[PDB]
Structure formats: structure tokens, C-alpha cells
Scaffold this active site. Structure first.
Site, PDB file in Angstrom:
ATOM      1  N   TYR A 192      -2.494  26.332  26.527  1.00  0.00           N
ATOM      2  CA  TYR A 192      -2.669  26.925  27.419  1.00  0.00           C
ATOM      3  C   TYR A 192      -1.518  27.413  28.491  1.00  0.00           C
ATOM      4  CZ  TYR A 192      -2.009  22.836  30.831  1.00  0.00           C
ATOM      5  OH  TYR A 192      -1.027  21.644  31.379  1.00  0.00           O
ATOM      6  N   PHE A 214       3.080  28.558  36.891  1.00  0.00           N
ATOM      7  CA  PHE A 214       3.035  27.358  36.697  1.00  0.00           C
ATOM      8  C   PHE A 214       2.849  26.214  36.133  1.00  0.00           C
ATOM      9  CE2 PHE A 214      -1.172  28.121  37.852  1.00  0.00           C
ATOM     10  CZ  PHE A 214      -2.106  26.721  37.451  1.00  0.00           C
ATOM     11  N   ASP A 215       2.169  26.279  34.916  1.00  0.00           N
ATOM     12  CA  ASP A 215       2.097  25.104  33.884  1.00  0.00           C
ATOM     13  C   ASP A 215       1.701  25.757  32.291  1.00  0.00           C
ATOM     14  OD1 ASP A 215       1.767  22.593  33.416  1.00  0.00           O
ATOM     15  OD2 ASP A 215      -0.380  22.693  33.406  1.00  0.00           O
ATOM     16  N   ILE A 254      -9.872  21.549  35.636  1.00  0.00           N
ATOM     17  CA  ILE A 254     -10.744  22.282  37.140  1.00  0.00           C
ATOM     18  C   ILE A 254     -12.210  22.665  37.066  1.00  0.00           C
ATOM     19  CG2 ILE A 254      -9.168  22.720  39.010  1.00  0.00           C
ATOM     20  CD1 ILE A 254      -8.561  25.234  37.203  1.00  0.00           C
ATOM     21  N   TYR A 280      -8.265  24.984  42.437  1.00  0.00           N
ATOM     22  CA  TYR A 280      -7.309  24.088  43.967  1.00  0.00           C
ATOM     23  C   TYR A 280      -7.863  23.951  45.714  1.00  0.00           C
ATOM     24  CZ  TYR A 280      -4.962  22.247  39.750  1.00  0.00           C
ATOM     25  OH  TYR A 280      -5.308  21.877  38.584  1.00  0.00           O
ATOM     26  N   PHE A 331      -5.640  31.695  33.670  1.00  0.00           N
ATOM     27  CA  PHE A 331      -5.578  31.072  32.817  1.00  0.00           C
ATOM     28  C   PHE A 331      -5.369  31.758  31.113  1.00  0.00           C
ATOM     29  CE2 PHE A 331      -4.643  26.598  34.169  1.00  0.00           C
ATOM     30  CZ  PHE A 331      -5.230  27.260  35.471  1.00  0.00           C
TER      31      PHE A 331
END
EC number: 5.2.1.8
Length: 108
Positions: A27, A37-38, A57, A83, A100
Site C-alpha cells: 500500500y 505519509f506511509d 482504519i 483518523y 490509499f
């Protein structure tokens, strides 16, 4: 809103994650402006989570469940499924819609 799923490349169109199964994914997570961010791909290690255990999430729990094995899809997740108002200090700002890019490699 909840989670929107937009296909990127098709999977088998037949095998969908069920509650209790482990989802093995690569991902990339990005803010709505496009900032990454990830990313499991940057670590060269797929990410595993068990569906229904709220290890991810809510947008992931309900969105990945809609994907077939081998599918790559774009999940756009509103803050309520994400979030929320709080976000994640220094990573995810308040009230953030997240995008994502997710590939479901296999189920275990």
C-alpha cells in the site's frame, strides 16, 4: 462520507476477504494534497492485518473487503472512516481525507 473504491487493475473478481482472514497487501498512503505519509512498498515488506479486528482504519476494514485477490484499487477515505478530527500528530492533520493505493496480494 465513507470509503470510495476505484479500481486500478483487476483481481480475480471472485475471492473476497472474509472476517478473520489475514490480508496481505502492499500500500501507499497519501494526504488529499498528494503527499505520501506511509508506504509499505518503501519498506519492501507487505503489510498484514486480520479483517474484522480493527487493526486498521475503518475505511480499510470496509474498503479492502470489497477487493478481490490480486486487485489493485484506490481507496479514498473520509475522516470519519480515518483518523477523524484528531488526526495523528505530525503525520495526519485534523479532518483529513486520505487516499490509499492498495494491492491485495493474497489471503492467509
Amino acid at each position: 462520507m465513507g470509503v470510495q473504491v476505484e479500481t486500478i487493475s483487476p483481481g480475480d473478481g471472485r475471492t473476497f476477504p472474509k472476517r478473520g482472514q489475514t490480508c496481505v497487501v502492499h500500500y501507499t498512503g497519501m494526504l488529499e494534497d498528494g503527499k505520501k505519509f506511509d508506504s509499505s512498498r518503501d519498506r519492501n515488506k507487505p503489510f498484514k492485518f486480520m479483517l474484522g479486528k480493527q487493526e486498521v482504519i475503518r475505511g480499510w476494514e470496509e474498503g479492502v473487503a470489497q477487493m478481490s485477490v490480486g486487485q489493485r484499487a484506490k481507496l479514498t477515505i473520509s475522516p470519519d472512516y480515518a483518523y477523524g478530527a484528531t488526526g495523528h500528530p505530525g503525520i495526519i492533520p485534523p479532518h483529513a481525507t486520505l487516499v490509499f493505493d492498495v494491492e491485495l496480494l493474497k489471503l492467509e
